[PDB]
Every structure is written in C-alpha cells, then in structure tokens.
Write an enzyme that holds these catalytic residues in place. Sequence first.
Site, PDB file in Angstrom:
ATOM      1  N   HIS A 136     -18.898  11.612 -25.218  1.00  0.00           N
ATOM      2  CA  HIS A 136     -19.680  12.458 -26.128  1.00  0.00           C
ATOM      3  C   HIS A 136     -18.997  12.703 -27.475  1.00  0.00           C
ATOM      4  CE1 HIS A 136     -22.423  13.313 -22.885  1.00  0.00           C
ATOM      5  NE2 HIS A 136     -21.454  13.925 -22.169  1.00  0.00           N
ATOM      6  N   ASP A 171     -22.381   7.452 -15.717  1.00  0.00           N
ATOM      7  CA  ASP A 171     -22.325   8.932 -15.777  1.00  0.00           C
ATOM      8  C   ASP A 171     -23.780   9.471 -15.735  1.00  0.00           C
ATOM      9  OD1 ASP A 171     -19.901  11.021 -17.057  1.00  0.00           O
ATOM     10  OD2 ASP A 171     -21.982  11.701 -17.192  1.00  0.00           O
ATOM     11  N   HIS A 173     -24.865  11.828 -17.463  1.00  0.00           N
ATOM     12  CA  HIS A 173     -25.201  12.169 -18.837  1.00  0.00           C
ATOM     13  C   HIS A 173     -25.282  10.921 -19.722  1.00  0.00           C
ATOM     14  CE1 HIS A 173     -23.205  15.817 -17.125  1.00  0.00           C
ATOM     15  NE2 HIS A 173     -24.315  16.363 -17.640  1.00  0.00           N
ATOM     16  N   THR A 185     -24.841  -1.828 -34.958  1.00  0.00           N
ATOM     17  CA  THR A 185     -24.219  -3.144 -34.854  1.00  0.00           C
ATOM     18  C   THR A 185     -24.722  -3.869 -33.600  1.00  0.00           C
ATOM     19  OG1 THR A 185     -22.179  -4.391 -34.801  1.00  0.00           O
ATOM     20  CG2 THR A 185     -22.127  -2.296 -33.659  1.00  0.00           C
ATOM     21  N   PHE A 193     -27.567   4.694 -18.222  1.00  0.00           N
ATOM     22  CA  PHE A 193     -28.422   5.259 -17.190  1.00  0.00           C
ATOM     23  C   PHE A 193     -28.090   6.749 -17.087  1.00  0.00           C
ATOM     24  CE2 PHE A 193     -29.540   1.061 -15.641  1.00  0.00           C
ATOM     25  CZ  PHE A 193     -28.461   0.311 -16.049  1.00  0.00           C
ATOM     26  N   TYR A 217     -30.052  -3.332 -29.432  1.00  0.00           N
ATOM     27  CA  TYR A 217     -28.723  -3.418 -28.799  1.00  0.00           C
ATOM     28  C   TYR A 217     -28.294  -2.067 -28.227  1.00  0.00           C
ATOM     29  CZ  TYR A 217     -28.548  -8.117 -30.749  1.00  0.00           C
ATOM     30  OH  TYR A 217     -28.812  -9.401 -31.063  1.00  0.00           O
ATOM     31  N   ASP A 259     -20.196  12.353 -11.850  1.00  0.00           N
ATOM     32  CA  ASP A 259     -21.168  13.420 -11.799  1.00  0.00           C
ATOM     33  C   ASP A 259     -22.576  12.950 -11.416  1.00  0.00           C
ATOM     34  OD1 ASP A 259     -21.530  12.223 -14.227  1.00  0.00           O
ATOM     35  OD2 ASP A 259     -21.058  13.991 -15.458  1.00  0.00           O
ATOM     36  N   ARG A 265     -21.441  19.527  -8.977  1.00  0.00           N
ATOM     37  CA  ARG A 265     -21.732  20.905  -9.374  1.00  0.00           C
ATOM     38  C   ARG A 265     -22.639  20.970 -10.608  1.00  0.00           C
ATOM     39  NH1 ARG A 265     -18.751  25.141  -7.051  1.00  0.00           N
ATOM     40  NH2 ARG A 265     -16.634  24.732  -6.295  1.00  0.00           N
TER      41      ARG A 265
HETATM   42  O1  LIG Z   1     -20.130  15.481 -17.784  1.00  0.00           O
HETATM   43  C1  LIG Z   1     -20.217  15.402 -19.000  1.00  0.00           C
HETATM   44  C2  LIG Z   1     -20.094  16.621 -19.914  1.00  0.00           C
HETATM   45  C3  LIG Z   1     -21.113  17.681 -19.513  1.00  0.00           C
HETATM   46  C4  LIG Z   1     -21.248  18.800 -20.543  1.00  0.00           C
HETATM   47  C5  LIG Z   1     -22.106  19.939 -20.004  1.00  0.00           C
HETATM   48  C6  LIG Z   1     -22.204  21.076 -21.013  1.00  0.00           C
HETATM   49  C7  LIG Z   1     -23.050  22.240 -20.491  1.00  0.00           C
HETATM   50  C8  LIG Z   1     -22.297  23.192 -19.580  1.00  0.00           C
HETATM   51  O2  LIG Z   1     -22.604  23.245 -18.406  1.00  0.00           O
HETATM   52  N1  LIG Z   1     -21.321  23.945 -20.112  1.00  0.00           N
HETATM   53  C9  LIG Z   1     -20.575  24.857 -19.404  1.00  0.00           C
HETATM   54  C10 LIG Z   1     -20.744  25.108 -18.028  1.00  0.00           C
HETATM   55  C11 LIG Z   1     -19.951  26.046 -17.382  1.00  0.00           C
HETATM   56  C12 LIG Z   1     -18.975  26.754 -18.090  1.00  0.00           C
HETATM   57  C13 LIG Z   1     -18.794  26.517 -19.454  1.00  0.00           C
HETATM   58  C14 LIG Z   1     -19.595  25.571 -20.103  1.00  0.00           C
HETATM   59  N2  LIG Z   1     -20.424  14.256 -19.584  1.00  0.00           N
HETATM   60  O3  LIG Z   1     -20.559  13.119 -18.815  1.00  0.00           O
HETATM   61  O1  LIG Z   2      -9.961  14.869 -16.156  1.00  0.00           O
HETATM   62  C1  LIG Z   2     -10.145  14.731 -17.363  1.00  0.00           C
HETATM   63  C2  LIG Z   2      -9.408  13.801 -18.283  1.00  0.00           C
HETATM   64  C3  LIG Z   2     -10.250  13.736 -19.551  1.00  0.00           C
HETATM   65  C4  LIG Z   2     -11.243  14.904 -19.437  1.00  0.00           C
HETATM   66  C5  LIG Z   2     -12.688  14.510 -19.643  1.00  0.00           C
HETATM   67  C6  LIG Z   2     -13.530  15.252 -20.465  1.00  0.00           C
HETATM   68  C7  LIG Z   2     -14.857  14.875 -20.643  1.00  0.00           C
HETATM   69  C8  LIG Z   2     -15.336  13.756 -19.993  1.00  0.00           C
HETATM   70 CL1  LIG Z   2     -17.000  13.280 -20.212  1.00  0.00          CL
HETATM   71  C9  LIG Z   2     -14.523  13.011 -19.176  1.00  0.00           C
HETATM   72  C10 LIG Z   2     -13.198  13.386 -18.999  1.00  0.00           C
HETATM   73  N1  LIG Z   2     -11.049  15.397 -18.082  1.00  0.00           N
HETATM   74 CA   LIG Z   3     -24.939   7.573 -18.259  1.00  0.00          CA
HETATM   75 NA    NA Z   4     -25.101  -1.403 -30.734  1.00  0.00          NA
HETATM   76 ZN   LIG Z   5     -21.381  13.568 -17.277  1.00  0.00          ZN
END
Ligand SMILES: O=C(CCCCCCC(=O)Nc1ccccc1)NO
Ligand SMILES: O=C1CC[C@@H](c2ccc(Cl)cc2)N1
Ligand SMILES: [Ca+2]
Ligand code: NA
Ligand SMILES: [Zn+2]
EC number: 3.5.1.98
Length: 369
Positions: A136, A171, A173, A185, A193, A217, A259, A265
């Site tokens: 992200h 993932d 997300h 590009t 997905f 792309y 996830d 969770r």
């Molecule tokens: O898994 C991720 C990142 C997920 C980001 C989710 C943000 C929303 C959220 O649940 N925030 C949050 C939850 C509990 C406590 C503090 C922040 N990317 O793959």
């Molecule tokens: O265990 C970890 C290492 C890097 C960090 C992280 C933060 C966000 C995402 Cl999406 C993936 C990994 N947590």
């Molecule tokens: Ca994904």
């Molecule tokens: Na691209």
């Molecule tokens: Zn995620």
Amino acid sequence: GGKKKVCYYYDGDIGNYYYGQGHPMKPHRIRMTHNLLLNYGLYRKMEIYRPHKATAEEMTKYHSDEYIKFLRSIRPDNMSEYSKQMQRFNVGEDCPVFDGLFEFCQLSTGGSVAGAVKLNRQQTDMAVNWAGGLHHAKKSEASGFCYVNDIVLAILELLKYHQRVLYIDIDIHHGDGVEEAFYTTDRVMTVSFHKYGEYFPGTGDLRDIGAGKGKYYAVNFPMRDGIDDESYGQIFKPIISKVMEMYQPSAVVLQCGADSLSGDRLGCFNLTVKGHAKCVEVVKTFNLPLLMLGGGGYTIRNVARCWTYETAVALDCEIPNELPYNDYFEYFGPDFKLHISPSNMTNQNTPEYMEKIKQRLFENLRMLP
Ligand SMILES: O=C(CCCCCCC(=O)Nc1ccccc1)NO
Ligand SMILES: O=C1CC[C@@H](c2ccc(Cl)cc2)N1
Ligand SMILES: [Ca+2]
Ligand code: NA
Ligand SMILES: [Zn+2]
C-alpha cells in the site's frame, strides 16, 4: 522443471518492532514463522541470509526525498513538532509512529531488494522475504500499515535486467500502491485478487485496467466475502496461465498476504493453507525467477502455518501435519496441526459471478500485442 534453489531473507530483530497496544499488525508473526520452519528442519534445504538495512538512497529510487527524510526523523518523542508532516504523509493512525520505525522499514525493504539482486545475478531461482509485501505504500505517503514499498523497489531492481515483470497479489486487500507505481507502464503487469466493496483500500475495480502505455497491464479480480479453496483455485490457474501466455514476463513477484485465510481477524475470505499455497504451486510451474513476499495476516498462528507451508512448497519438501515442538507451540492449540479447516461462512461469490469476472478479464488480456 527440477527442484529450485531457494534463498530466504530473515532478520531476527524484526519481531521486536511494535505498532502499539491494540494494533492488529504484529511483526512477531515473522519470528513465529521462522521458528516454526526451523523446527521442521527446512533450513537444511535453503540458504538463509540476513538482509542489509536498505539506505535512503535505495528507498528514493521510488519514494520522495521529503517523505524518506521524514521517516528517518520522526520518533515518538518529537511527534508534536511534526504534526503537519504526519498528516501530509498519512502517519499517526493506521500507520503509527513507533520506536525504530525507520530501521523496521530498512529491514523489510532490504530483504526484498537483496532477493531481487540475487535473482538478477542468477544465483537463485526463488528468493523469499516474508517480512516484505508492503503493497500500500505510495511515493510520498504511508498507507494500510505500510511505510516503504519494498515491492516497488524490488521490481525496479528486477527491471534492470528484465524487460517484463509480473506482479501477483493474493493478499485479501488490493495492491494499490504497486498498481499505482506501474499503472502507466507495460514493463510491469500487476494482477490483484482481493475483496472489493466497502473494504480497504477501496480501489481495484474490474474496470481499472491501466493507462497510457500501461493500458491493459493492470488486472483486478474483485471478490465478495467467503471465497473458498475450490472457487479461488478455479479462477487463479486459468487467469495466471492466460497472463503468462499473453504477457511472457521474465520475472515474477508474488505477494502472499495470509489475510485471505479462513479465520483472519481483519479478513473475510475462507481459504485454507492448502488453498492459499496452491497459488504458490501454480506460479512455480512457470519456471521463472520468482520473488515471494509476505503481506497482511492478523491471526498470527495461521500466518505462521501459511508461510511455513509455502516455504516447504517452494522447496518441494513434504512436511508432516503434526507440528513439531517450537518456541510458540501454545499458539497452535487446540489441535497443534499445520493445516486448517475452512469455516461454514457462506461463499457470496457464486460460480456464475466467478466465471463472468474471469470472462471479462480474458477479453482485456486479448488486447495485449
Ligand atoms: O492487510 C493489509 C493492511 C490492512 C489495513 C487495514 C486498515 C483498517 C484497520 O482495520 N485499521 C485498524 C484496525 C485496528 C486498529 C487500528 C487500525 N494489507 O494487505
Ligand atoms: O510483520 C511485518 C513486517 C512488515 C510489516 C507489514 C506491514 C504491512 C503489510 Cl501489508 C505487510 C507487512 N509487518
Ligand atoms: Ca490482493
Ligand atoms: Na503496469
Ligand atoms: Zn491485506
């Protein structure tokens, strides 16, 4: 295509970084993963490397100087002097300020970039960095618990020797930061997905297909709650095979965020570790230089199980379902097995929905030259 050489990146300090009380992201999960796979004996079969700490120089190949300077400066004890900058760069809520934050980014990034260099030099077939996959983060902004986009930096390293790189993101997300960096590009194709609809980050519509020279792309497969192994497996292999046939990448980056497992969770999918890992298996069959990375994952016992099994898959090494003793054994109760059962949650992704989205994505892939 033979058993592959695997290089695996781990720094034992990673598990000591702490997002704060109540924050669902637990870097400790990387240490659990490592300890489990050591106890299964998988170190016997792969080279284990401690990554370097990536420098500001390395990070500003993508990220802005101003954003990296801020990450290098900001600390819990000087936060109030940085209020404006914190808001500009989206730090302080989902992406809190914690002790050692910049060193944490250096370690995550270092693994991904070191892996890409090892692939470039043809010293390995697969590189693994479970502490990476921070899909992200954007040029000048933290997002979604991510601060530095190790994936983008690793792909920029691969592009030094590879005309075409394929990124695949399983993932739950959408990999918005990677898609955004390469949206215009054709030298990187991004395939994600993800759960779509009323869900973070809110991007990754079917109709987002790239722009300019990158039009067609970017590939987005939006899903609903409750997808299971059989439904996911029936779309992943055909989509990835069509992408391989049409795009003909020379290197692949796979984000393996855990996830998307049953019982996560923050996630609402219903995949097993076998279902998730089947994605690794499919990508491996194409026999391309492959960088495999972590991602989200919030039920940490299942993250450890998932990435342990996927390491074993990378190694083509069968491991027993009975967990070996390890430093975190109690976390794996009440069954103490590697594999997990799906829940009985309803799959909102009908067979018809899955086939229709797949057919729309095939029409877009027919537009490649
Ligand atoms: O898994 C991720 C990142 C997920 C980001 C989710 C943000 C929303 C959220 O649940 N925030 C949050 C939850 C509990 C406590 C503090 C922040 N990317 O793959
Ligand atoms: O265990 C970890 C290492 C890097 C960090 C992280 C933060 C966000 C995402 Cl999406 C993936 C990994 N947590
Ligand atoms: Ca994904
Ligand atoms: Na691209
Ligand atoms: Zn995620």
